[PDB]
Design an enzyme around this catalytic site. Structure first.
Site, PDB file in Angstrom:
ATOM      1  N   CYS A 206      47.605  30.789   4.188  1.00 51.56           N
ATOM      2  CA  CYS A 206      47.801  29.685   5.126  1.00 51.56           C
ATOM      3  C   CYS A 206      46.813  29.928   6.259  1.00 51.56           C
ATOM      4  O   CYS A 206      45.666  30.246   5.982  1.00 51.56           O
ATOM      5  CB  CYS A 206      49.249  29.600   5.572  1.00 51.56           C
ATOM      6  SG  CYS A 206      50.032  31.158   6.040  1.00 51.56           S
TER       7      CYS A 206
ATOM      8  N   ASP B 231      53.180  19.708  10.413  1.00 54.13           N
ATOM      9  CA  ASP B 231      52.552  20.448  11.513  1.00 54.13           C
ATOM     10  C   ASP B 231      53.550  21.319  12.271  1.00 54.13           C
ATOM     11  O   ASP B 231      53.199  22.409  12.739  1.00 54.13           O
ATOM     12  CB  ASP B 231      51.897  19.471  12.504  1.00 54.13           C
ATOM     13  CG  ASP B 231      50.437  19.163  12.178  1.00 54.13           C
ATOM     14  OD1 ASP B 231      49.984  19.411  11.053  1.00 54.13           O
ATOM     15  OD2 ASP B 231      49.726  18.685  13.076  1.00 54.13           O
TER      16      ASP B 231
ATOM     17  N   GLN C 298      57.614  33.747   9.689  1.00 52.74           N
ATOM     18  CA  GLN C 298      57.341  33.803  11.120  1.00 52.74           C
ATOM     19  C   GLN C 298      58.501  33.329  11.977  1.00 52.74           C
ATOM     20  O   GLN C 298      58.643  33.800  13.117  1.00 52.74           O
ATOM     21  CB  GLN C 298      56.098  32.965  11.457  1.00 52.74           C
ATOM     22  CG  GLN C 298      54.825  33.487  10.823  1.00 52.74           C
ATOM     23  CD  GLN C 298      53.594  32.668  11.210  1.00 52.74           C
ATOM     24  OE1 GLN C 298      53.314  31.622  10.629  1.00 52.74           O
ATOM     25  NE2 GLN C 298      52.871  33.142  12.209  1.00 52.74           N
TER      26      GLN C 298
ATOM     27  N   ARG D  31      53.940  30.542   6.109  1.00 52.80           N
ATOM     28  CA  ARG D  31      54.060  29.760   4.882  1.00 52.80           C
ATOM     29  C   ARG D  31      53.775  30.606   3.657  1.00 52.80           C
ATOM     30  O   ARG D  31      54.498  30.529   2.652  1.00 52.80           O
ATOM     31  CB  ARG D  31      53.098  28.575   4.937  1.00 52.80           C
ATOM     32  CG  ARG D  31      53.495  27.562   5.940  1.00 52.80           C
ATOM     33  CD  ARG D  31      52.489  26.446   6.015  1.00 52.80           C
ATOM     34  NE  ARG D  31      52.509  25.873   7.349  1.00 52.80           N
ATOM     35  CZ  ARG D  31      51.682  24.926   7.770  1.00 52.80           C
ATOM     36  NH1 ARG D  31      50.766  24.417   6.952  1.00 52.80           N
ATOM     37  NH2 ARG D  31      51.777  24.480   9.011  1.00 52.80           N
ATOM     38  N   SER D  32      52.738  31.445   3.733  1.00 56.64           N
ATOM     39  CA  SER D  32      52.401  32.316   2.617  1.00 56.64           C
ATOM     40  C   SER D  32      53.562  33.210   2.260  1.00 56.64           C
ATOM     41  O   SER D  32      53.825  33.456   1.080  1.00 56.64           O
ATOM     42  CB  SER D  32      51.184  33.184   2.972  1.00 56.64           C
ATOM     43  OG  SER D  32      50.045  32.354   3.122  1.00 56.64           O
TER      44      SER D  32
END
EC number: 3.1.3.48
Length: 298
Positions: free
Chosen positions: A215, A181, A262, A221-222
Site C-alpha cells: 500500500c 480514502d 494501523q 491495508r497490506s
C-alpha cells in the site's frame, strides 16, 4: 465460531481501541539498523516505517542491497509474503529487481497513486501497451500486455524482461482500486472477492516466490490482506474456526514487520473479513457467488 462471539463482545462493549492498544504493547521490537543508515534515507518513504534487519529483503546488488521490504513467513500456513512500501521515483527499479530476484508471480497493490490529494506511490507500471518502461539502473524492461478493469479491482498482465539475460516472465498485477480514502470498506465482500481472485491466479502458491503486497507504507491495508489470507488458510488446514486466534496470528506476523494493522478499525475489519470468509472455507461454496454479486464487480 468463537471469534464471532469474541467479535460481538468487543463490538457490544466498544472495546476495539483497547484490544488494539494491547496488541501494540505486546508487539515485537527488533533492530532496524540498516534502514537507518544515512545512505538509505532516500530509499524510505516514511521515517517511522522500517524493515527489521532479520527479515528484510536484500537486493542482489553489491553497492547497496537495501529496499524497504520485509519477508513474512507463516510456517504453519506454508505461506510467505513480501510486504513493501509504495515505490518512490528513485526506487522503482529496485522494486522490479526484487520481484525478479525473489521469483514472485504476483504484485498486490492496495492503494491509489493519489489519495487525499497527495502522491502515495510512484507510477511504476506502464499505462499503455505500446509505451514500455525501461529501468536503466537495474537493466529490466516492463511491458503492459493486457488490462482487465472491473468495478472494484483491475488485473494487469505484465511482461518483465531481464535485459542482461533476455529472459522474460509474466507478472500479474492485482490492483484493488476501491479502498476509501478514510476508514475501511463498510462490507468485506469485494475485498474477499479480490482476495479469492488473487488466490485463484496461482500467485500465492508455493511453486512461485512470495507474492509482493504493498500500500503506501506497506503495513496497514497490506497487513489486513495478509492477516485475512493466513487466518482463512489456517482454518482450512484445521477445518476448525475456533482454533484460530486472530490476535495471535497478528502478533506472529508483527515479528517480521512492524506496525501491521494501523488502526482499530482495520483490526475490526480484519475480524469481519475472516468471519465472513469462513463461510466459504467451511463448505458453503455458494457464498463466493454472493460476494461477486454484492461486490457489484460489473
Amino acid at each position: 465460531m468463537e471469534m464471532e462471539k469474541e467479535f460481538e463482545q468487543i463490538d457490544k462493549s466498544g472495546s476495539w481501541a483497547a484490544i488494539y492498544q494491547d496488541i501494540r504493547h505486546e508487539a515485537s521490537d527488533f533492530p532496524s539498523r540498516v534502514a537507518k543508515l544515512p545512505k538509505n534515507k532516500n530509499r524510505n518513504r516514511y521515517r517511522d516505517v522500517s524493515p527489521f534487519d532479520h527479515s528484510r529483503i536484500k537486493l542482489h546488488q553489491e553497492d547497496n542491497d537495501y529496499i524497504n521490504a520485509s519477508l513474512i513467513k507463516m510456517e504453519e500456513a506454508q505461506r510467505s509474503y513480501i510486504l513493501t512500501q509504495g515505490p518512490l521515483p528513485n526506487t522503482v527499479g529496485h522494486f522490479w529487481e526484487m520481484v525478479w530476484e525473489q521469483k514472485s508471480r504476483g504484485v498486490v497493490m492496495l492503494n491509489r497513486v493519489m489519495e487525499k490529494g497527495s502522491l502515495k506511490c510512484a507510477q511504476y507500471w506502464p499505462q499503455k501497451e505500446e509505451k514500455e518502461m525501461i529501468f536503466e539502473d537495474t537493466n529490466l524492461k516492463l511491458t503492459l500486455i493486457s488490462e482487465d478493469i472491473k468495478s472494484y479491482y483491475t488485473v494487469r498482465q505484465l511482461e518483465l524482461e531481464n535485459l542482461t539475460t533476455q529472459e522474460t516472465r509474466e507478472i500479474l498485477h492485482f490492483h484493488y482500486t476501491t479502498w476509501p480514502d478514510f476508514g475501511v470498506p463498510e462490507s468485506p465482500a469485494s475485498f474477499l472477492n479480490f482476495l479469492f481472485k488473487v488466490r485463484e491466479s496461482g500467485s500465492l502458491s508455493p511453486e512461485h516466490g512470495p507474492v509482493v503486497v504493498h500500500c503506501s507504507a506497506g503495513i496497514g491495508r497490506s497487513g489486513t490482506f495478509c492477516l485475512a489470507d493466513t487466518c482463512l488458510l489456517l482454518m482450512d488446514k484445521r477445518k476448525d474456526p475456533s482454533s484460530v486466534d486472530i490476535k495471535k496470528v497478528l502478533l506472529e506476523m508483527r515479528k517480521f514487520r512492524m506496525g501491521l494493522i494501523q488502526t482499530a478499525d482495520q483490526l475490526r475489519f480484519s475480524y469481519l473479513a475472516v468471519i465472513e470468509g469462513a463461510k466459504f472455507i467451511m463448505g458453503d461454496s455458494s457464498v463466493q457467488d454472493q460476494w461477486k454479486e454484492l461486490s457489484h464487480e460489473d
